[PDB]
Design a protein around this ligand. Structure first.
Ligand SMILES: Nc1ncnc2c1ncn2[C@@H]1O[C@H](COP(=O)(O)OP(=O)(O)O)[C@@H](O)[C@H]1O
Ligand SMILES: Nc1ncnc2c1ncn2[C@@H]1O[C@H](COP(=O)(O)OP(=O)(O)O)[C@@H](O)[C@H]1O
Ligand SMILES: Nc1ncnc2c1ncn2[C@@H]1O[C@H](COP(=O)(O)OP(=O)(O)O)[C@@H](O)[C@H]1O
Ligand code: BEF
Ligand code: BEF
Ligand code: BEF
Ligand SMILES: [Mg+2]
Ligand SMILES: [Mg+2]
Ligand SMILES: [Mg+2]
Ligand SMILES: [Zn+2]
Ligand SMILES: [Zn+2]
Ligand SMILES: [Zn+2]
Ligand SMILES: [Zn+2]
Lengths: 64, 333, 371, 337, 370, 363
């Protein structure tokens, strides 16, 4: 199958990605009724990658 | 492959053993008796370790490689037992049995229990390779024609001197399983160690076998005894017997009765009696069942039966016992 | 007064003697002769209905199979072997309630125990009660310990729901079915228990307790214990009524009686009382039509009434005697039409009330007045 | 069977039903109402092939692409089917639950997110109410399809979200011509097949290629002895083949034709058995005939609706009641309430 | 617009002093007698229809047992444990949703935690509400504690239908039953509450809501707060009626009187002017059916008419005297059928009009001429 | 780009303010006044038939309740919270479809959720829809959280039919019976929508669409979409008539006049012709019922003629004159019961044939 073109391209150190995921992973919903919660938000702006996780009672934001 | 009968297995067991054994049948009394007879034969021949497995759809390859590992070389001799699924071997075990047939040793004595299998199941290659090596035992429940003879012989091996009336009542009360015949025979023998089975002694017990479903409830209606079948229904409701089963019995029997009622005007009774191949001991009651209950009675009874089954089916259950005894009280007229 | 508060009748009156077991003589004689002769099986299963005697017969069998006097059909009840079980603590007797033990770990723990010799008794007894809660693998383990039982190994099994068991377990073990206790058996045992405890009581009270308990003698004893506690150590049919008849449904006998007798004011009061208790109207109509059908069909044969109507016969027979079948058929047609018309009425109360009024208006003996 | 079968008269409807999607104005839902075996399944399949195809050709699907190549292999990750398991008959909450929970994720291949319910009447009302949210407000580029023999039996809410597209059975002459080209026998049989099946040519094909036709013949012959003799009970063996609804429907169609013959009508459905029609009219009284027809329809409904009902008991009671009605002096029922 | 007001009269005006429990004189008398005499059973089962006060009475008794010491008959001043009980702070007050503990393991877990008595109180009280939905095994599990529990633990079970749950539990300690409140008591309570909140009330509205409340103060209070919302802090007759949707019972009375009098033109006039009133046709039919049942009721006793019916009692008497019972039953059957097929009529107004016209055509005395 | 910018009218024209709701003034007034005066109840139960607005009224109530600009009867619609609740991406408005979340696990999850603080809005509100099919265990577990919740918890229940609710569940929440929308309201809202979206129409088709959908605006819009999908994107009388398959009064009156005179052969030939044209049989039965109603009206008082069409009113007048009221009542009752039994009929055409042939019973 033809691969999908990407609109967001970057490259990361393993340390940065590991830190982000360890910082926000425990903060994302499991099977929660709100479908858009069961996941992790990866915002990017300027030279900064930000990561957001919520379950309605918690919030982890990590910016690097 | 040697096909045998449960009574004739012992002699074969005495003459020589076979590495693979198969026990196919529905009646579990002869199944367990044959199994533990073979087991005590093996124990008399030094077999010590006895493994049993319950093969289900959950049972799989990781539930059988331990079996295969078991019978290589551990000590002396051992035996193995399996429990087969309700429908017989499947495609999942079609290969497991083929693998098991690849290793047969005098160290392991193979025992298999189960019910009757489809003719395409013994057509498999593993069964053919196991023909000369195995012995199959027939373990179905035969008809009631040989039932009195078999129970008389059994009571003789149980050291019980039955009377003709005792034989008749014990047969008539337990046409469901050899387990019932056994438990009744041992109950009678323990109660009366002498062994003479007089009819007044054998009738007491607790009741006619159990509260059963068909026998007397239907029979009293056949002769028209309202009180008898009505008390039987009262007892059935006392013990919480399933109304659906009672309805199924009525459906399966009253239809034959209706078939009997027809053609009686233009055909002699006995010709209709033997045309349907209905049992003669049952024919003796079918006679007055047809004589007493007229066609209008049959129509009304079937109509109320259909109404009752309807109201019961859509989860209403509007006093099923009341309508059942209503059916009874119509059939007693 | 405070009788039985120390020992609930069920516990207090656990049969320590075969003569103390009223009923189940078919099983009692079999057990006695099996013990005396020696035809003792490796496993015994009993089937009954709640408070039927299964634990009682199992413990009595434990007494008779491991008494100091030997394997005796008539245990003394005073020896150390007997008194250890009577108090409840017997080393070689293991009583297990399968309701809380459905795991395979604990079943295997007992499986290991099946091998060693008894510490004090002649044989090791593993009583498992209400075995139907055992897991499938626990059932398979039980079968594996059934097939090769050591000599000192005897199994006593008991469950209120015996058909839930697999086929193999039933096949391996010898089964005794305890008949559900008749109302007269329960009443006689209760009367003997109360007389032996030197307390005043009334006969109809015992009859009502036996009817309410529905064949279970332990439940009957618990219910009579409730009666003793509520009545301050007195058994009165008044207190018995106030405890069971209140929870029991006593309706549509007065309703049918008044409707046949054309008592408009009484039937209005009855419907008001029915509405006061917050009962269901469709179920009320079902009960009405059932009673009407029973009354009609008793005319077919007097034996139509079983023991289910123990509190109805005194009224049922008199009502069915003074009634014509044509009138009953008309009433049944009216009530069926009313039940069909019930859902679409303004209120189910209003609908059943209107159906009663339609029945009263078309009363053959007393037609409704018209100006 | 394999990709089912296209039916020639279906070509117009599809065209219309694809225009609404070519313009982009396509309502996400669609409740296609069509008779059994009519050919709605091929329509839904072709629609979904057009929808999930990455390159939608004009009125065609792709011609060549992977997007529907995975469709032909029946393994597309967006295309979901909701049919009860081969061993069961009621569509559970669990399958619709899985499909709707997997819908909230994006489209795997960047195209649409198409769902399909094979038969809506089989949907348990709990499953219907679990699917209500998904139908009312689906995510972007999500479409649906449904098939019903009739819409009125569906839940009051599920059809209210959907458009009730209808498949008109082909004109009588065209259907007769198509069936004649497919199956070869006398036109009376073909007219009986079409009128019995309410016009569904596929159902006529199922009647012919299925054994039932011969069994239908059997019933006719049995009635050829029953009505002249007033002996209906012997019909039992004819009416018990796990096809009691269909066979009772054929019996009711015969009785309809007889009542038509009374109020002499130009056209009747059973045209292969005119002698049977005449005999049925001759022996049976119109009030008795209508009561018997009502009972036949009632029993067919009772059998079709409640599963687990005993067929033998019901049909036996029906035949006994009919025999009773043929006796003079009986009071016949009338529909009411 | 914005605010910090409201308390939900249901959430505000619950009894907390034994003086606000309206009706149920039997259970309050029994509880007062038992507390004053010190005789307390080990299990309490309050039964009755919905919206009556069983939960509130349970809270009442629970706080009457543990309130800064003192075995009072409920009156307890400056009682801390009581104020946390009414504030939702659990103090030896364990409410249990039995549906979350249906399985026998959960009730076994409930059993094993029975020894934790000393928690800022004397008795720990269990409220297993809707107790009739327990499993049989769970019932048996809790029965052992039921017969002989620790002294410090009191069971208070609340249920709607005592028929469902097993007989042995029914008989254990006590079974109190709360009757449905009469519309008169509902009127008193609504009047008193709306007086407490400086809000005017028309007695017609109070009677309308009291009859519209099925003898349950929680229904009455929900409906009354709906009425307050519909108006602007004032309950009025026309607003209340437009809220319920019930038309002029006098409009229906004139309609049925016309149907009796066999004047189809007046019937058409009434039905079209009722159409202009924007009333539900199903409501019109059910109100006429209620009036027909009432006119059949007066045939057996004059007391059939409620207090409100004093407005139209005279017309009831006249119709009852005029019309024989067979005609009342004929009309009732006709209109009841008509309501049965109302959903299938081409239009609700069309169906109601046809049903009335049929009752006119099948008129027992003066039918429509052919 | 290809993301289907078009949205169906049944959802695009969803109400966005209390001034955009068609009808139900009896509940909008109560809700707005409760918002303004300071009386807000912790559990609202909106109940009504399909397509009358329970979800929309509940969503507008949620918009108002947790708007950051106080708590007003008029949501601003430009803020954040209004925008997310309109889009349905707000954390504190949680949509629970009671068909799915009926097992005790999900109910326990919900009761665990209600104990915490909100995230963005003042109130965390659970929009539970189709509540009337929560399993009994779910309702009994939900009683406590529906009775006395925390301060920031409010419940909005939407049910298709109140009957299936346990009555105790009814009693703890505030009932709002959404009345079915009148034909005039539906036709006016359709006129406003279609004029707004620059779509040509004519009032006749609007009246037909309003009549076909029995008081369900969503149904009206569904039929609008069906009527614009066929017929070159426009609403016209011929288009809606073909879509519904409805028939003029002439043919139905031919049927009723042939059947009232026991002309069975003519009746069956008319049915054959109608099948050939392929009409909707339920439509035939409703037209027959309407004609019989008009005949009955004419019989009662001569003033109420058939004047809505008044094309072949000669036949109606003659039929009324020549038939007793009893016979017309029997014909109506027979046709009506037959109409009730169309789904149970093995085929629609044969069900109508049964009903008509049974109407032929009288002589
Ligand atoms: N057949 C019986 N004879 C005498 N008492 C009995 C009998 N059955 C039950 N009981 C009474 O009920 C109490 C409990 O009996 P038990 O045998 O434990 O019942 P279960 O079958 O349910 O284990 C006994 O203490 C005894 O008082
Ligand atoms: N007897 C009563 N006295 C005072 N208020 C009552 C009474 N019964 C019900 N209520 C009102 O109803 C509200 C809820 O009552 P509740 O006791 O929950 O009824 P239920 O029996 O249905 O649970 C209470 O807050 C109170 O305002
Ligand atoms: N009262 C109303 N005012 C305006 N439109 C309405 C109204 N009721 C329903 N609708 C229309 O119906 C569509 C669905 O409405 P909805 O509120 O979801 O009904 P439901 O109560 O059945 O969930 C809306 O998008 C709107 O177009
Ligand atoms: F001890 Be029993 F089984 F109730
Ligand atoms: F507990 Be109640 F029925 F509101
Ligand atoms: F379609 Be609605 F939510 F009833
Ligand atoms: Mg026990
Ligand atoms: Mg409550
Ligand atoms: Mg909705
Ligand atoms: Zn001893
Ligand atoms: Zn493609
Ligand atoms: Zn206090
Ligand atoms: Zn805002």
């Amino acid at each position: 199958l033809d691969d999908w073109q990407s609109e967001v391209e970057f490259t990361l150190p393993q340390a940065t990605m590991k830190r982000l995921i360890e910082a926000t992973q425990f903060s994302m919903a499991h099977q929660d009724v709100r479908y858009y919660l069961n996941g992790m938000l990866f915002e990017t702006e300027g030279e900064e990658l930000r990561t957001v996780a919520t379950d309605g009672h918690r919030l982890a934001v990590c910016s690097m | 492959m040697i096909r045998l009968y449960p009574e004739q297995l012992r002699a074969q067991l005495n003459e020589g053993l076979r590495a693979a054994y198969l026990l196919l049948g529905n009646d579990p009394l002869l199944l367990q008796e044959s199994q533990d007879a073979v087991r005590q034969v093996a124990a008399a021949q030094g077999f010590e370790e006895h493994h049993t497995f319950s093969i289900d759809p959950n049972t799989d390859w990781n539930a059988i490689f331990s079996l295969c590992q078991a019978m290589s070389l551990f000590a002396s001799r051992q035996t193995l037992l399996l429990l087969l699924p309700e429908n017989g071997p499947n495609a999942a075990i079609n290969e497991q049995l083929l693998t098991l047939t690849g290793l047969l040793h005098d160290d392991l004595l193979l025992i298999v229990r189960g019910n009757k299998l489809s003719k395409a199941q013994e057509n498999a290659a593993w069964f053919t390779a196991l023909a000369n090596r195995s012995v199959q035992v027939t373990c179905q429940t035969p008809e009631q024609a040989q039932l009195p003879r078999w129970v008389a012989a059994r009571a003789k091996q149980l050291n019980l001197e039955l009377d003709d009336a005792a034989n008749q009542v014990l047969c008539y009360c337990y046409e469901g399983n050899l387990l019932a015949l056994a438990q009744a025979l041992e109950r009678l023998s323990l109660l009366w160690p002498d062994g003479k089975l007089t009819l007044p002694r054998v009738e007491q017990a607790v009741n006619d076998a159990a509260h059963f479903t068909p026998f007397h409830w239907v029979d009293a209606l056949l002769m028209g005894k309202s009180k008898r079948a009505l008390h039987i229904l009262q007892q059935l409701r006392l013990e919480g017997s399933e109304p659906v089963i009672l309805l199924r019995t009525l459906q399966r029997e009253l239809l034959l009765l209706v078939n009997l009622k027809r053609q009686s005007a233009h055909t002699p009774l006995r010709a209709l009696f033997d045309k349907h191949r209905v049992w003669q001991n049952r024919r003796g009651m079918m006679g007055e069942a047809l004589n007493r209950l007229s066609q209008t009675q049959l129509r009304q009874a079937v109509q109320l039966l259909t109404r009752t089954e309807l109201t019961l089916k859509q989860d209403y259950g509007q006093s099923v016992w009341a309508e059942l005894e209503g059916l009874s009280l119509l059939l007693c007229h | 007064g405070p009788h039985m508060s120390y020992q609930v009748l069920a516990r207090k009156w656990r049969p320590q003697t075969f003569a103390d077991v009223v009923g189940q003589e078919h099983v009692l004689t079999a057990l006695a002769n099996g013990l005396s002769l020696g035809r003792i099986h490796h496993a015994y299963l009993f089937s009954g209905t709640r408070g039927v005697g299964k634990t009682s017969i199992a413990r009595l069998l434990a007494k008779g199979l491991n008494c100091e006097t030997g394997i005796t059909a008539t245990p003394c009840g005073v020896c150390d072997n007997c008194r250890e079980i009577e108090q409840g603590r017997f080393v070689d007797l293991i009583e297990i309630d399968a309701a809380s033990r459905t795991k395979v770990e604990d079943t295997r723990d007992l499986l290991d125990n099946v091998q060693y010799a008894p510490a004090r008794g002649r044989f090791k007894v593993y009583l498992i009660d209400e075995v139907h809660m055992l897991s499938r693998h626990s059932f398979n383990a039980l079968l594996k310990t059934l097939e090769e039982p050591p000599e000192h190994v005897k199994f006593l099994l008991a469950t209120t729901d015996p058909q839930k068991l697999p086929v193999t377990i039933l096949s391996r073990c010898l089964q005794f079915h305890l008949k559900a206790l008749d109302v007269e058996q329960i009443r006689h045992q209760l009367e003997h228990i109360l007389n032996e405890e030197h307390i005043a009581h009334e006969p109809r009270a015992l009859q009502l307790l036996a009817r309410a308990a529905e064949g279970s003698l332990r439940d009957a004893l618990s219910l009579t214990d409730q009666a003793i506690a509520s009545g301050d150590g007195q058994v009165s049919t008044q207190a018995v009524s106030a405890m069971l008849g209140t929870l029991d449904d006593d309706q549509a006998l007065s309703l049918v009686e008044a409707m046949v007798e054309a008592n408009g004011e009484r039937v209005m009061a009855l419907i008001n009382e029915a509405a006061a208790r917050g009962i269901e109207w469709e179920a009320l109509l079902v009960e009405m039509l059932g009673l009407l059908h029973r009354i009609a069909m008793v005319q077919l044969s007097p034996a139509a009434l079983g023991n289910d109507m123990a509190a109805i016969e005194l009224r049922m027979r008199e009502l069915a005697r003074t009634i014509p079948p044509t009138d009953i058929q008309l009433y049944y047609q009216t009530l069926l039409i009313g039940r069909k018309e019930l859902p679409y009425a303004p209120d189910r109360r209003m609908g059943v009330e209107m159906t009663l009024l339609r029945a009263l208006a078309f009363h053959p003996r007393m037609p409704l007045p018209e100006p | 069977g394999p990709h089912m079968r296209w039916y020639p008269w279906l070509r117009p409807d599809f065209e219309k039903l694809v225009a609404s999607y070519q313009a982009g104005r396509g309502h996400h839902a669609l409740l296609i109402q069509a008779l059994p075996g009519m050919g709605d399944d091929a329509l839904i399949y072709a629609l979904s092939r057009y929808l999930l195809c990455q390159q939608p050709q004009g009125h065609k699907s792709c011609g060549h692409c992977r997007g529907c190549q995975l469709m032909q292999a029946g393994t597309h990750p967006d295309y979901y089917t909701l049919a009860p398991e081969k061993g069961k008959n009621t569509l559970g909450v669990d399958a619709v639950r899985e499909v709707t929970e997997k819908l909230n994720e994006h489209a795997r291949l960047g195209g649409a997110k198409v769902v399909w319910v094979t038969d809506a009447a089989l949907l348990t009302d709990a499953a219907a109410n679990a699917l209500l949210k998904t139908l009312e407000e689906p995510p972007a580029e999500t479409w649906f399809f449904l098939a019903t023999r009739e819409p009125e039996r569906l839940l009051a809410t599920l059809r209210s979200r959907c458009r009730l597209h209808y498949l008109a059975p082909p004109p009588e002459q065209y259907a007769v011509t198509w069936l004649s080209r497919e199956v070869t026998m006398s036109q009376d049989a073909l007219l009986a097949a079409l009128r019995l099946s309410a016009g569904s040519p596929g159902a006529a094909l199922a009647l012919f290629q299925g054994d039932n036709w011969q069994a239908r013949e059997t019933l006719c012959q049995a009635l050829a002895y029953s009505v002249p003799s007033g002996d209906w009970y012997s019909l039992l063996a004819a009416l018990n083949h796990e096809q009691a609804p269909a066979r009772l429907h054929w019996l009711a169609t015969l009785l309809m034709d007889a009542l038509k013959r009374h109020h002499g009508a130009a056209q009747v459905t059973n045209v292969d058995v005119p002698g049977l029609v005449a005999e049925l009219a001759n022996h049976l009284s119109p009030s008795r005939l209508q009561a018997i027809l009502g009972d036949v329809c009632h029993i067919r409904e009772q059998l079709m609706s409640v599963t687990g009902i005993n067929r033998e008991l019901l049909i036996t009671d029906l035949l006994l009641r009919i025999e009773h009605y043929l006796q003079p002096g009986v009071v016949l029922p009338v529909p009411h309430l």
